[PDB]
Amino acid sequence: GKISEKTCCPGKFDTEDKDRLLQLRQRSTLRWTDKNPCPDNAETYCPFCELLGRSWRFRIHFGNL
């Protein structure tokens, strides 16, 4: 879970409005800590939650190839 001096929480992969999602994850998620995910109203998010884009508005946007 270390990345530089920071440590990543488990991320969040849990959506209440399931029917929005065309696909749902069937595989298990890899684990590295017992700690809970970052709060949904936090200001500061760990690097994994930045990569997830959880921090019309994107933080990391992938274009098509």
Partner RNA sequence: UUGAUGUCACGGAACCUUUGUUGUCUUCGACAUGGGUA
Judged by the rule CB under 7 A, the positions of this chain that interact with RNA are: 11-16, 18, 20-27, 52-54, 58, 60-64
Ligand-binding annotation for 8, yes or no, is no
For 1, 4, 40, the CA distances from 11, given in Å and listed in that order, are 11, 18, 11
Q: 51: which residues sit within 8 A by CB, 6+ positions away?
A: 60
Distance, CA of 4 to chain centre: 18
Residue 26 site contact among Zn ion, RNA, none (CB < 5 to 8 Å, cut-off depends on kind): RNA
Degrees, nearest 5: CA angle 34-26-9: 25
- Residue 9 interface partner, choices RNA, Zn ion, none, CB cut-off 5-8 Å depending on type: Zn ion
Residue whose CB is less far from RNA, 4 or 62: 62
- Determine whether the annotation assigns residue 9 to a binding site: yes
Which residues does the annotation place in the binding site for Zn(2+)?
9, 38, 46, 49
